[PDB]
Design a protein around this ligand. Structure first.
Ligand SMILES: CCCCCCCC/C=C/CCCCCCCC(=O)O[C@@H](COC(=O)CCCCCCCCCCCCCCC)COP(=O)([O-])OCC[N+](C)(C)C
Ligand SMILES: CCCCCCCC/C=C/CCCCCCCC(=O)O[C@@H](COC(=O)CCCCCCCCCCCCCCC)COP(=O)([O-])OCC[N+](C)(C)C
Ligand SMILES: CCCCCCCC/C=C/CCCCCCCC(=O)O[C@@H](COC(=O)CCCCCCCCCCCCCCC)COP(=O)([O-])OCC[N+](C)(C)C
Ligand SMILES: CCCCCCCC/C=C/CCCCCCCC(=O)O[C@@H](COC(=O)CCCCCCCCCCCCCCC)COP(=O)([O-])OCC[N+](C)(C)C
Ligand SMILES: CCCCCCCC/C=C\CCCCCCCC(=O)O[C@@H](COC(=O)CCCCCCCCCCCCCCC)COP(=O)([O-])OCC[N+](C)(C)C
Ligand SMILES: CCCCCCCC/C=C\CCCCCCCC(=O)O[C@@H](COC(=O)CCCCCCCCCCCCCCC)COP(=O)([O-])OCC[N+](C)(C)C
Ligand SMILES: CCCCCCCC/C=C\CCCCCCCC(=O)O[C@@H](COC(=O)CCCCCCCCCCCCCCC)COP(=O)([O-])OCC[N+](C)(C)C
Ligand SMILES: CCCCCCCC/C=C\CCCCCCCC(=O)O[C@@H](COC(=O)CCCCCCCCCCCCCCC)COP(=O)([O-])OCC[N+](C)(C)C
Ligand SMILES: CCCCCCCC/C=C\CCCCCCCC(=O)O[C@@H](COC(=O)CCCCCCCCCCCCCCC)COP(=O)([O-])OCC[N+](C)(C)C
Ligand SMILES: CCCCCCCC/C=C\CCCCCCCC(=O)O[C@@H](COC(=O)CCCCCCCCCCCCCCC)COP(=O)([O-])OCC[N+](C)(C)C
Ligand SMILES: CCCCCCCC/C=C\CCCCCCCC(=O)O[C@@H](COC(=O)CCCCCCCCCCCCCCC)COP(=O)([O-])OCC[N+](C)(C)C
Ligand SMILES: C[C@@H]1CC[C@@]2(OC1)O[C@H]1C[C@H]3[C@@H]4CC=C5C[C@@H](OCCC(CO)CO)CC[C@]5(C)[C@H]4CC[C@]3(C)[C@H]1[C@@H]2C
Ligand SMILES: CC(C)CCC[C@@H](C)[C@H]1CC[C@H]2[C@@H]3CC=C4C[C@@H](O)CC[C@]4(C)[C@H]3CC[C@]12C
Lengths: 1105, 82, 91, 91
């Protein structure tokens, strides 16, 4: 059969052919009509039975000879005499209507289908999400209309209640009653909840217009939506999405839904609403505008074990306005007022024509309903009762059902309704157990229910006591929420490449992941001795700063909205933002280096930049309050984040807006100075003092207080306690600005000598100038090896890889290597010939020198890059070379397109030679630079300098050259000008940021560079090394200064959020919309008062007479 | 449409024929100019437009190897039967 | 256009019909040229197709790329991309 | 220094836990130099009963709005019982 439906669900065709009631209509002979008119008590004319078994009964006379002992005519049973056979129709109807087909579905099951098969039909066969709520509406059929007030509202709440809770709305479906009002409410809120509300019409296969159009095994039957006139039959309401048509009986009989629909209301409740949650799915009932068998149904749902609560919207119709008042004349759960038989049964007789023959039977159903009014919620329209029934529906499940507030809270948690819990569960006088609000916190975190975490923290959950090792372990291991698949990919890459079967994650492994992501020398609290010891042993089993540990959790689980929330709680907000930026950046990288499908490297790179911006914006806030305290924030050790600093974390994440911020640039400038006040001093007194040492004693140095915001070496901070004479020399020569000019003068003197060497004739032995040059480069080279093998990151292959990322270190490496090739050839060359330049090994050596010196003039751009104006232009030059590449490739092609024809036309008698490669490129290149070779253009002219080249075809080359230069100058050179004009500002801007950023690494370098410059640096190498055998900069703060700084951080974070709320609440767009909404509200009350004052006019009539 | 007209049942060949031929609304004069350019360059006196001709116009406008449902065997056969 | 299915395809067919109509109006000696009215109607549906593509692309890139190349079977077994190329619709 | 894990801040505070018969001047010395508090321009000494449920939502919003405004614009101290079972709660 290739279908679970075809093999499971059935039809109910009336095989047995009871004649109609007894009597023929007319038409004296009783053989034609006893066959023709006389339908079956099934409910159809005799030939429609089409009994595969008894098809030949009608031809004879019929099944079941007439007389049959009248008793045995009612003996027909839907149970017995009805062959259970396949479905024969299950598919997809449509509804040509309000601009959409508004598709739907039907199964057309029998009736006595088991109850479980529905749940299996609904969830896997139809692929429907199990709901968190079930609204079972009821009422009467074929009523005209409602007040235009109530009509708009009932939907608005019914929709809201169902969309916010993923609810099912069980209707009859038929567009002659309850379903109509449901559907008419759907279209007023359609294309907003058209994919969250799965309404279901459990209607019969009886009363319906075109039962035969619904037929068809696996069909897409195009069902109508026009009210077929001249009839009473009803249509399936278009705006429903699912139908369970019930094949039984016949047309007209519509009673076979209570047995099935009710079971569905019973079987959904035995399902668990969520995995983490143990409560069953709730069921509610909204009766509007009802009838007599509804009042039976209301009491049948209240009396049930457990009770299904009830909503009653007064004024919709009889049963609503009735019950709303009939359970108003009563004690809370007891007896009625002064004898109420007259007025109650009066309306029960007026609404329902009874006359005491059925007027007690309803009143007896009423007095049972009032035994439980706590479950009959009633929506008092007029006096703004519970605001758009969603509260009234949902709170009815939270009104009296002797359910603990823990269960009242979880239910809101599964619904994702905070407003309900805060206003109706966290009510005054409410009382809680000890870890009920803890278990509710564990659920809200695992479920990513961020707004409930807020509600519980406020109401008094404490994360210091809540969070524990095993709980925090669980939060990583849960598969009951929006997990991150990639966390395991990072764990298995740090463990050994493998994983055990289930592998409940450990926190030491989380610690290992963070170290891999945070990189460098980051060592996490989870991989430390004490944690590694205590965890083996698993207040001791708490955490001192739990929101640092959950921020990490939320960021490794890719739970950003929870991360942002948790970030705003606790301390060290700027640091946490920078750690989050680094975690996400490193996660984004390994996602970009994994063959998985959902790359998530722009989602993570965007989350990194979101926290990156937060750190930058907190820095600006701090800088606007106090510059000196903001600079301290960049460099204080954190002690909860591996003793790093906020600036080092930002540099780790390559976060340029933070490092290029004027606060960070102000600090870097102060560290450049050292102890020197370079506001009272001038750069020429520094240079003068490097050459005149005794002038060091007449500079304006800085006090220990002026240095309070500046990180220092341990040796440098001990000489702050006082300024004696020898301390002042220390302060000078250890300042980075001094080391710079001290190395810059030595470098300039190095180039003057090396320029002298290459320009002056070279003898066998190197001159004194050449020896000094070699000493510089040798010791300069050792100095570079020192810098590499003492950098940061432990791993040589990472130290290597970072250092060779800088342009000038690649060039310096080439410069140093090429030099000693040159010195080797120059010095190692044996002179067999007395005239130098007869010895080629010598020449190759000298020519390497003359080319190696280019590297050393270009390194002056690195020194010049220390200036704020010059440095960006140096960075621009390299960026513009990269960007202009393809314009230059096109120019190179134009050059060859001219060069090859020119040479071929003018030199037709050439043999193969490498000079051909020169000649096709040489003159065409120099043409770009203002050389037209004027007396070579027309080689056959009298003024030609190439008269022997005159020959056939040579008249073509001036035309070629004219075209060539048009293309190069008039087009390509000016395109390049236009290129540079138009990208200048964006390249200059990027280059300023890069200049400012690379200023960190430059200034930090000169704190570890020796005092002495590269010729005399060898002493600082030998001595320092030898003194180490005989045996970074930190900010030092007093305990009171740590206090005042931690308070400064907190104050400025508070200012930061206040200024945002007040900037958003004061914008015109926000004031227009609050004005918009408040004018919307008034426009109701203005009219409402308008109606009241028009009904105080009713007073004027009655009062005055 | 909302109140319950169904275009699947409303629209028919002769109705849809009429909608092209009506001069009782904001017509396009240029449609005939495209028809007479695909027919043979000529036109009979009144020339109630056919749907095969509409099919021919669309193929000219859509170009390439576009072949319309109105110039297909089944439509060309059934339309003859109408 | 807003009713039925294949909304992106229908918009691209409309663009092509109006574009070709605009052309022959520009090549007819009639008085009311209507070649900027039709070229504007073509670009109105052209923009609709572009905007539906962006919407689809923002939801799921891989399913949006399928929309460009599935055969339509109500529009001569063409594709939405070929229809756009036919109309020289660069956006 | 006690704290209060609550509405998104620790909401820190302070206690001295003095005896009872401490001299009156020692408080002023405690408040101004030991705690480093600006001498105020006003002192509001609220009083009332303890453990009452709630107020009209009209009055509740207003009493603060004025009580705050009066105290912030005047650098005032608000003397309460402190305990969250009465006067202090509404403050
Ligand atoms: C004694 C003498 C012996 C030796 C002599 C020879 C020594 C040779 C010396 C070579 C200099 C070595 C410098 C290399 C620097 C590498 C590090 C670095 O920053 O790289 C970066 C720059 O990209 C490069 O550096 C790529 C190479 C640049 C061109 C260097 C030679 C050009 C001149 C040759 C002319 C020959 C002309 C011939 C015909 C006349 C990496 O790239 P990026 O920055 O990420 O770029 C991204 C681009 N984007 C922005 C579009 C995305
Ligand atoms: C992180 C980046 C920076 C650091 C990178 C550092 C390492 C970089 C790499 C450096 C090595 C570069 C190559 C060295 C020369 C070999 C090539 C050559 O031609 O040699 C010649 C000299 O042969 C000799 O023996 C005389 C040279 C004396 C040694 C000077 C070079 C080594 C010093 C290194 C100082 C740097 C060390 C720095 C501190 C440790 C051999 O030829 P010939 O015999 O003359 O000619 C034969 C023909 N004949 C018949 C004409 C005679
Ligand atoms: C506005 C101002 C310009 C007015 C234009 C009027 C045009 C009138 C056309 C005149 C052509 C005739 C003049 C030369 C007489 C023929 C013989 C002769 O002397 O040949 C000479 C070369 O020249 C040639 O061999 C042919 C030159 C043809 C190209 C001329 C330009 C065509 C128009 C533009 C084309 C561009 C595209 C145009 C379309 C976009 C021989 O000179 P030689 O090199 O000294 O050779 C002798 C030595 N040898 C024997 C060793 C080789
Ligand atoms: C698409 C745009 C088209 C542009 C216009 C068409 C192109 C221009 C048309 C020019 C007219 C044609 C000249 C024919 C002359 C023949 C004379 C002769 O004997 O041979 C000559 C032709 O041979 C050459 O090699 C010279 C060709 C002229 C090149 C002009 C390049 C500048 C382009 C300008 C573009 C700007 C145009 C300005 C606007 C109009 C060479 O003479 P010779 O080798 O010395 O011969 C020996 C003679 N002797 C003994 C006396 C020394
Ligand atoms: C620039 C300011 C910045 C800071 C720089 C810091 C300092 C670092 C820089 C350089 C260190 C100093 C090196 C020079 C030592 C030798 C000098 C000399 O004359 O030698 C030579 C001495 O002998 P002579 O009498 O010339 O003998 C004749 C020639 N003969 C030797 C070939 C036989
Ligand atoms: C590593 C760091 C170095 C730092 C510098 C300090 C240490 C170095 C300082 C000085 C060393 C001088 C050694 C002199 C040796 C005596 C013989 C001699 O050369 O006589 C020459 C006189 O001298 C000159 O002509 C000067 C040549 C050096 C020019 C650069 C000096 C200024 C830069 C540095 C100082 C200012 C600093 C500027 C920056 C603010 C005469 O010529 P010749 O050379 O005999 O002729 C050779 C001809 N032959 C080969 C064909 C036979
Ligand atoms: C005579 C000499 C002749 C040729 C040498 C030419 C010099 C290198 C050419 C440029 C190559 C380049 O872009 O830089 C590389 C040269 O890295 C080195 O270490 C080069 C050392 C000399 C060999 C290093 O690349 P990088 O700068 O680390 O780029 C980062 C790449 N990343 C983004 C993938 C991390
Ligand atoms: C990484 C390390 C790489 C380099 C390793 C070391 C390479 C070492 C290389 C070469 C060593 C050569 C030793 C001698 C070989 C035998 C020949 C001989 O002795 O004499 C012959 C030398 O003739 C020449 O042409 C020599 C050229 C060699 C120098 C090439 C340098 C390459 C370095 C590039 C830069 C690299 C930069 C790298 C960094 C980026 C002839 O001499 P003669 O006797 O006078 O003959 C007179 C003839 N006459 C009659 C015509 C007048
Ligand atoms: C015995 C000898 C006696 C004489 C010794 C002394 C001689 C003189 C020595 C040296 C020359 C330079 C002196 C001028 C310095 C000006 C001061 C200044 O502000 O400097 C800046 C330059 O910072 C640098 O790093 C400049 C690097 C200089 C070397 C580059 C030379 C380029 C040559 C190639 C061209 C070919 C030319 C070749 C010529 C043949 C540093 O300041 P800043 O960082 O920009 O401050 C900005 C931030 N702020 C706004 C907060 C302030
Ligand atoms: C003897 C001859 C005269 C002497 C020469 C004069 C001295 C030499 C002149 C200028 C040198 C300028 C120094 C570099 C400045 C820093 C740039 C830098 O940091 O990286 C740049 C890379 O850089 C490149 O891609 C190439 C850099 C320029 C090489 C030019 C070589 C000269 C010949 C070339 C022409 C040969 C062709 C013609 C042959 C016919 C960055 O560019 P980016 O990728 O966009 O940005 C990423 C930056 N980031 C990674 C930091 C974020
Ligand atoms: C496409 C048009 C078709 C071509 C015809 C029309 C073109 C215009 C005109 C006419 C063409 C030139 C004719 C005049 C020259 C003939 C005389 C002569 O011998 O001249 C020379 C050879 O010349 C040749 O051998 C001719 C080569 C023609 C190449 C094609 C021209 C490009 C056309 C592209 C046009 C695109 C325009 C720009 C784009 C808008 C000189 O020879 P010699 O020195 O006397 O020989 C003696 C040698 N000996 C001493 C060794 C023995
Ligand atoms: C895309 C571009 C298309 C054009 C082009 O680049 C790529 O294609 C290349 C092919 C090259 C030639 C290949 C082989 C030889 C043979 C050799 O024979 C030694 C002779 C003698 C030496 O003195 C012995 O004594 C001499 C050189 C020569 C002719 C090349 C010249 C340059 C040419 C033309 C190059 C040219 C620039
Ligand atoms: C092909 C060989 C044999 C011939 C010589 C090659 C030429 C092109 C070489 C020799 C020396 C080279 C220069 C040496 C030093 C530098 C400084 C560096 O920061 C940029 C490249 C630059 C500017 C080189 C460019 C290319 C260069 C000029």
């Amino acid at each position: 059969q290739k279908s679970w439906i075809e093999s499971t669900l059935t039809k109910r065709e009336c095989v047995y052919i009871i004649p109609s009631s007894k009597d023929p209509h007319r038409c004296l002979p009783g053989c034609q009509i006893c066959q023709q008119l006389v339908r079956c008590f099934c409910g159809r004319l005799v030939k429609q039975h089409a009994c595969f078994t008894a098809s030949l009964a009608m031809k004879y006379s019929d099944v079941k000879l007439g007389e049959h002992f009248n008793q045995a005519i009612e003996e027909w049973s839907v149970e017995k005499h009805t062959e259970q056979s396949p479905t024969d129709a299950y598919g997809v109807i449509n509804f040509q209507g309000g601009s959409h087909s508004y598709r739907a579905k039907y199964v057309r099951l029998s009736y006595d289908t088991k109850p479980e098969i529905i749940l299996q039909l609904l969830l896997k066969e139809w692929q429907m999400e199990l709901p968190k709520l079930v609204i079972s509406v009821h009422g009467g059929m074929q009523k005209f209309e409602l007040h235009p007030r109530i009509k708009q509202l009932l939907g608005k709440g019914l929709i809201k209640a169902a969309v916010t809770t993923g609810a099912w709305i069980l209707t009859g479906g038929v567009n002659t009653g309850v379903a109509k009002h449901v559907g008419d409410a759907l279209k007023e809120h359609a294309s907003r909840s058209s994919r969250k509300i799965c309404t279901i019409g459990i209607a019969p296969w009886g009363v319906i217009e075109n039962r035969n159009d619904l037929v068809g095994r696996d069909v897409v039957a195009p069902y109508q939506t026009l009210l077929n006139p001249l009839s009473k039959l009803n249509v399936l309401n278009n705006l429903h999405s699912h139908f369970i048509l019930v094949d039984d009986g016949t047309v007209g009989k519509y009673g076979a839904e209570v047995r099935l629909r009710r079971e569905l209301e019973k079987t959904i409740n035995q399902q668990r609403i969520h995995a983490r949650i143990g409560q069953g799915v709730p069921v509610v009932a909204l009766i509007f505008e009802g009838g007599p068998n509804v009042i039976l149904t209301v009491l049948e749902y209240l009396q049930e074990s457990p009770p299904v609560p009830v909503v009653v919207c007064e004024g919709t119709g009889r049963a609503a306005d009735l019950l709303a008042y009939i359970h108003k004349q009563t004690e809370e759960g007891g007896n009625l007022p002064d004898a109420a038989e007259p007025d109650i049964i009066s309306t029960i007789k007026k609404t329902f024509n009874f006359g005491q023959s059925e007027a007690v039977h309803l009143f007896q159903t009423m007095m049972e309903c009032m035994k439980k009014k706590e479950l009959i919620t009633v929506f008092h329209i007029g006096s703004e009762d519970h605001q758009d029934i969603d509260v009234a529906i949902l709170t009815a499940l939270l009104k009296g059902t002797n359910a603990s507030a823990f269960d009242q809270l979880i239910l809101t948690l599964a619904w994702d309704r905070v407003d309900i819990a805060k206003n109706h569960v966290f009510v005054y006088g409410q009382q809680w157990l000890v870890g009920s609000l803890e278990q509710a916190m564990l659920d809200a975190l695992v479920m990513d229910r961020v707004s409930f975490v807020k509600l519980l923290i406020e109401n008094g959950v404490s994360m210091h006591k809540f969070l524990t090792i095993p709980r925090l372990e669980e939060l990583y291991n849960t598969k009951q929420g929006p997990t991150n698949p990639m966390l395991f990919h990072l764990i298995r890459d740090v463990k050994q490449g493998n994983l055990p079967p289930g592998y409940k994650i450990t926190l030491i492994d989380i610690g290992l992941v963070i170290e891999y992501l945070m990189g460098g020398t980051y060592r996490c609290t989870y991989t430390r001795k004490r944690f590694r010891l205590i965890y083996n042993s698993l207040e001791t089993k708490r955490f001192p700063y739990p929101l640092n540990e959950l921020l990490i959790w939320a960021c490794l689980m890719k739970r950003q909205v929870m991360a942002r929330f948790l970030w705003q709680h606790g301390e060290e907000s700027m640091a946490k933002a920078l750690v989050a930026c680094k975690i996400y950046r490193s996660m984004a990288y390994e996602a970009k280096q994994s063959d998985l499908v959902d790359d998530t490297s722009e989602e993570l790179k965007q989350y990194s930049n979101d926290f990156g911006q937060l750190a930058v914006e907190l820095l600006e806030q701090s800088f606007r309050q106090d510059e000196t305290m903001a600079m301290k924030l960049l460099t204080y050790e954190l002690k909860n984040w591996s003793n790093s600093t906020c600036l080092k974390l930002a540099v780790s994440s390559r976060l340029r807006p933070f490092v290029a911020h004027t606060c960070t640039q102000m600090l870097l400038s102060d560290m450049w100075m050292g102890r020197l006040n370079m506001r009272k001093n001038s750069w020429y007194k520094v240079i003068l003092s490097i050459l005149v040492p005794p002038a060091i004693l007449m500079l304006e140095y800085k006090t220990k207080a002026e240095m309070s915001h500046i990180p220092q070496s341990q040796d440098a901070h001990q000489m702050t306690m006082e300024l004696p004479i020898t301390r002042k020399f220390y302060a000078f020569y250890h300042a980075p600005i001094v080391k710079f000019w001290f190395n810059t003068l030595a470098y300039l003197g190095f180039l003057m000598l090396y320029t002298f060497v290459v320009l002056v004739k070279m003898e066998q032995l190197p001159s004194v100038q050449e020896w000094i040059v070699i000493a510089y480069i040798f010791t300069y080279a050792i100095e570079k090896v020192r810098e590499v093998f003492m950098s940061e990151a432990g791993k040589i292959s990472q130290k290597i890889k970072v250092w060779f990322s800088d342009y000038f270190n690649v060039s310096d490496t080439i410069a140093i290597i090429s030099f000693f090739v040159g010195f080797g050839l120059r010095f190692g060359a044996k002179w067999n010939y007395i005239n130098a330049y007869d010895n080629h090994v010598f020449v190759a050596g000298r020519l390497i020198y003359c080319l190696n010196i280019i590297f050393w003039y270009v390194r002056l751009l690195d020194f010049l890059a220390v200036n704020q104006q010059a440095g960006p232009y140096v960075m621009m030059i390299g960026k513009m070379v990269a960007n202009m590449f393809y314009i230059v490739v096109i120019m190179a092609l134009v050059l060859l397109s001219f060069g090859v024809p020119r040479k071929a036309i003018l030199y037709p008698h050439e043999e193969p030679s490498w000079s051909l490669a020169k000649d096709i490129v040489f003159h065409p290149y120099w043409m770009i630079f203002g050389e037209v070779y004027a007396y070579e253009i027309d080689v056959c002219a009298n003024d030609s300098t190439l008269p022997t080249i005159c020959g056939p075809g040579t008249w073509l080359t001036p035309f070629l050259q004219a075209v060539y230069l048009f293309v190069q100058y008039i087009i390509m050179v000016n395109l390049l000008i236009a290129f540079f004009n138009n990208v200048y500002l964006q390249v200059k801007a990027i280059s300023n940021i890069v200049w400012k950023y690379q200023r960190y690494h430059f200034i930090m370098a000169y704190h570890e560079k020796p005092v002495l410059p590269p010729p005399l640096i060898i002493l600082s190498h030998i001595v320092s090394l030898f003194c180490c055998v005989c045996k970074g900069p930190k900010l030092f703060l007093t305990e009171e200064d740590q206090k005042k700084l931690h308070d400064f951080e907190e104050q400025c974070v508070e200012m930061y959020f206040d200024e945002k709320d007040d900037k958003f609440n004061s914008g015109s767009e926000e004031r227009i919309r609050v004005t918009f909404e408040r004018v919307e509200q008034m426009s109701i009350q203005i009219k409402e008062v308008g109606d009241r004052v028009n009904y105080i006019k009713r007073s004027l009539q009655s009062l005055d007479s």
